[PDB]
Amino acid sequence: VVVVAKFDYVAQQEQELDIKKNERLWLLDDSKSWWRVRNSMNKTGFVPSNYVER
Amino acid sequence: AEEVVVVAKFDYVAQQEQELDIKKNERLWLLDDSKSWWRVRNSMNKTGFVPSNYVERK
Structure with missing residues (x-):
């Protein structure tokens, strides 16, 4: 799935990732949501949203 | 402030x-909450994360 940057980010x-308005991007995992999380050793990163619950 | 404790369903x-590596049942803090991100690649074959509202399928 090719997508397009709506705006500068x-x-x-x-x-x-820095993206420029109108940039052509390849959307990589059936457009799955990622969330940013932080562990108890203060390390942060992305995980797929479906892997965590409140 | 807008950081909720969440629990890993599965190892990742x-x-x-x-x-981030996580373990089943690990407690984590969820950041920028509401913020959904997509993993994308640019024309220079760099992969990275951008907020979903910044891109669209045309």
């Missing part, structure tokens, strides 16, 4:  | 440095 962490 | 093995 300036990465606010080294863990995010 | 990180496939990129920006992802």
